[PDB]
Design a protein that fits this description.
Chain A: It is found in: Cell membrane. Chain A: Belongs to the transient receptor (TC 1.A.4) family. Chain A: This is Transient receptor potential cation channel subfamily A member 1. Chain A: Homotetramer. Interacts with TMEM100. Interacts with EGLN1. Interacts with the scorpion wasabi receptor toxin at the same site that electrophiles but in a non-covalent manner. The structure is cut from a larger assembly and holds 4 copies of chain A. The first copy, chain A, is built from 19 helices and 2 strands. By secondary structure, chain A is mostly helical. In chain A, α2 runs parallel beside α5 and α9 runs antiparallel to α12. Chains A and B meet through α9, α12, α13, α14 and α16 of A and α1, α3 and α4 of B.
Chain lengths: 457, 80, 79, 89
């Protein structure tokens, strides 16, 4: 560090080395904390930053190299990004300014078909944090306020545009169902019919440009078949069949759209978990319905509701929903001694009403909490992870002239309104200890090599 | 209450308690509280063959009485 | 394991249900073992169809949940 | 959840653990001529269709540091053993 600070105090030019690994990149690849902190805490740091030589594949922009290699020095760099007010901490007047110059590239290098050497990402330093799992840097107050700035600038406005077009189809079918009578087929339905058709065709163009895809596929095909009598006369049975599927699945996905106003992304991550639970519990349920429906058909065939295998599987379907009188079905025929297999019928009752209730929920919660803890182990990581890729995918489709007005380089906030990195730091200290002792061992071998030995010869 | 109240209004409009969208959303509000006889409401009209969409009405029953019970408590305890 | 004892209930009650091809058995013991076999078929058919997944934790949780079932059968009979 | 967390603590371990012993028990009963056709030495896939090991690495680096300093301590004991001492005798 002192050799860097002495050479940078003089006019030493900061130039590449024909491998395009410059003065700053060479100190980062060796993970030298005290050197890059000396370049940060001195002058000519902006001159040192502007020479990153775009065509180099292995030596990128050094802010991205700082996130990959020495993230503790990026934290000191982000401490300099956060300014402050005067020392009088007035609760009514407090002035904190943030700087996002070390968090994104200039927007000319984001997207250009001419005069572009590279394909640089719009949120460059944040995506470097989530690709190297730098969770200490993502919970930094500058990176929080940067994401909150991109939220209020364009991220909230596109989610309101997303839910605005979804409510443009959700509200008309809700109006269309309550007004007219189901099972049949003024001057308001015809405009209401095409408004479903307009929002569903726009739904395909939104889908053209997971489980959120398959939920809207059920939404946007059953929307058309419900409104098809403006084009072609369809029978009313298939119309009201697809109507009832579409209405039920509208307010299912409207819960999912309204949840996405939160930046808690773990709901969509848990959506992959809970559909696998639902696809597991639909084959579990249909096989309990076949096991218990046929077992009660054999044991209870003298009774009336278990006379037929259809009647037995309907009655067991009624019991799984929770509607039977166990006195009149089982226990009062037991005291009448009209029960054929009374020790087996009770053993089937203790299983079906107690055991496979509790041996299934112990199994389903255990299979849930195994998969849920796999989500919660990087919960704060994954929440910010799908926060930035929601923002960078939306940035790649926004126009350039739109971003010229809405993007800000600085926000002013007013309040009146460590173990993995420790052992790695100890490994580099020990690696310099082995290098120093091996240099010193060569000198002691050279003292004994060139020495006056007369008396003790 | 709006999804299942309107979906049961379409599928079960031939029956008495689902005749009106207010009556359908009251009856589904009664089912969410846990007070209906599923025999007299669904299964006995199924054997009478007065059910219009019987494969859909059962698929709505397996969802509303089993799935969104357990797909919600798996989601709410997991978010808890 | 438990997959061995589940098929033992399956494969002995299968024979006693079909024993009237060899020897005339009374129909009460035949339909008793029939109802045990049919209920335990689709129990283990859930276990066979689960094994197409490479998620092996179901069979590991099978050791857990039978101990829960053998604990809740003595808890229930004493309540 | 006491017993389930004992399963989930090595969940990714145990899933692959009973994956291979399901495969090796099935391999021991398969015939040899059957495996001559079905076994492949190479697959071609088409997509168009760290803390325990860190301290152990630091222990072996420190164990070589104790060995080098003990070798070097014998040389400094040998410089002081064979040396010209006239003025500061």
């Amino acid at each position: 560090a002192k050799a860097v600070a002495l050479l940078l105090s003089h006019n030493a030019d900061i130039v590449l080395n024909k491998q395009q690994a410059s003065f700053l990149h060479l100190a980062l690849h060796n993970k030298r904390k005290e050197v890059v902190l000396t370049i940060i805490r001195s002058k000519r740091w902006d001159e040192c930053l502007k020479i990153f030589s775009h065509n180099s594949p292995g030596n990128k922009c050094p802010i991205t190299e700082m996130i990959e290699y020495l993230p503790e020095c990026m934290k000191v760099l982000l401490d300099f990004c956060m300014l402050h007010s005067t020392e009088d901490k007035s609760c009514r007047d407090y002035y904190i300014e943030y700087n996002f110059k070390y968090l994104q590239c200039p927007l000319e290098f984001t997207k250009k078909t001419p005069t572009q050497d590279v394909i640089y990402e719009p949120l460059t330093a944040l995506n470097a944090m989530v690709q190297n799992n730098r969770i200490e840097l993502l919970n930094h107050p500058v990176c929080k306020e940067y994401l909150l700035m991109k939220w209020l600038a364009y991220g909230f406005r596109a989610h309101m545009m997303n839910l605005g077009s979804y409510c443009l189809g959700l509200i008309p079918m809700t109006i269309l169902v309550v007004n007219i009578k189901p099972g049949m087929a003024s001057y308001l339905i015809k405009t209401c019919m095409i408004l479903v058709f307009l929002s569903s065709i726009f739904g395909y163009c939104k889908e053209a440009g997971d489980i959120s895809n398959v939920l809207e596929w059920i939404i946007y095909t059953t929307g058309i078949i419900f409104v098809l009598p403006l084009f072609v006369e369809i029978p009313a049975h298939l119309q009201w069949q697809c109507g009832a599927i579409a209405v039920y699945f509208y307010w299912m996905n409207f819960l999912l759209y309204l949840q996405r106003f939160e930046n808690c992304g773990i709901f969509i991550v848990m959506l992959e978990v809970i559909l696998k639970t639902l696809l597991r519990s639909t084959v579990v349920f249909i096989f309990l319905l076949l096991a218990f429906g046929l077992s009660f058909y054999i044991l209870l065939n003298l009774q009336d509701p278990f006379s037929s295998p259809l009647l037995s599987i309907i009655q067991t379907f009624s019991m799984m929903l929770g509607d039977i009188n166990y006195r009149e079905s089982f226990l009062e025929p037991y005291l009448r001694n009209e029960l054929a297999h009374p020790v087996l019928s009770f053993a089937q009752l203790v299983s079906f009403t107690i055991f496979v209730p509790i041996v299934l929920m112990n199994l389903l919660i255990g299979l849930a909490v195994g998969d849920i803890a796999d989500v919660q182990k990087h919960a704060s990581l994954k929440r910010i992870a799908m926060q930035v890729e929601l923002h960078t995918s939306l940035e790649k489709k926004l126009p350039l002239w739109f971003l010229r007005k809405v993007d800000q380089k600085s926000t002013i906030v007013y309040p009146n309104k460590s173990l993995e990195m420790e052992i790695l730091k100890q490994k580099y200290r020990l690696k310099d200890l082995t290098f120093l002792l091996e240099k010193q061992h060569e000198l002691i071998k050279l003292i004994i090599q060139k020495m006056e030995i007369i008396s003790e010869t």
